[PDB]
Design a protein around this ligand. Structure first.
Ligand SMILES: *CCC(=O)N1C[C@@H]2CCC[C@@H](Nc3ccc(C(F)(F)F)cc3)[C@@H]2C1
Length: 210
């Protein structure tokens, strides 16, 4: 009964991307993906206690949320970001899918050294498509801390210096039913840089606890 991708039975992540389009994409289109999960054998498990220290610890960080439950909704995603590509569009697209009509509240907490730095909260409503309800947070503008972070991260004269910086940089991402405050999906993101000739890639774990 364990999860096999990023989703419960109540809410599945269809696709998520963070991308940049260069200014000349209006002439011939071109999209560079920093990170990408597409979802059109169990997932491995990571103890949630090992990554507690990387996330905030008062209200709406990991200890309270996991003790809130439900335990099966909690995932860790490890990203190898692609960091080779000035004034283009920096974007996040998310799609979710579900069997209910809900209203989704998506929080994205960005944490540096395990304390929250910026947070964006978005509301999306179900639109019914083909017997299933679809939630489309498409082409959301990436918030300006992270765009500035990416340019300065790219500058770094070593690739292992980027991984040192990204070690203390995490994103926590909580999706709730707006009406009823049920947690549907909590995903913790930890970050490495990819090499240039490799693309972006990801590994998805379930978060489990004793
Ligand atoms: C304030 C930022 C914001 O609104 N969001 C939402 C989106 C949610 C989670 C993914 C994240 N996008 C990024 C992924 C990866 C990188 C990096 F630096 F390449 F590893 C940057 C942004 C944003 C945060």
């Amino acid at each position: 009964w364990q999860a096999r991708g990023l989703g419960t039975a109540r809410l599945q992540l269809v696709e998520f991307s963070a991308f940049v389009e260069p200014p000349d994409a209006v002439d011939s289109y071109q999209r560079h993906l920093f990170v990408h999960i597409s979802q059109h054998p169990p997932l491995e498990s990571v103890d949630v206690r090992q990554i507690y220290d990387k996330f905030p610890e008062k209200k709406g960080g990991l200890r309270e949320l996991y003790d809130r439950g439900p335990p099966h909704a909690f995932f860790l995603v490890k990203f190898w970001a692609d960091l080779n590509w000035s004034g283009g569009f920096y974007g996040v697209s998310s799609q979710y899918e579900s069997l209910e009509h809900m209203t989704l509240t998506c929080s994205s907490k960005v944490c540096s050294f395990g304390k929250q730095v910026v947070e964006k909260v978005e509301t999306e409503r179900a639109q019914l498509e083909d017997g299933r309800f679809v939630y489309r947070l498409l082409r959301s503008p990436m918030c300006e801390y992270l765009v500035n972070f990416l340019h300065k991260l790219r500058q770094l004269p070593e690739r292992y210096m980027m991984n040192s910086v990204l070690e203390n940089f995490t994103i926590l991402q909580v999706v709730t039913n707006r009406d009823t405050q049920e947690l549907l999906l909590c995903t913790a993101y930890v970050f490495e840089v990819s090499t240039s000739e490799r693309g972006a890639q990801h590994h998805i774990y379930r978060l489990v606890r004793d």
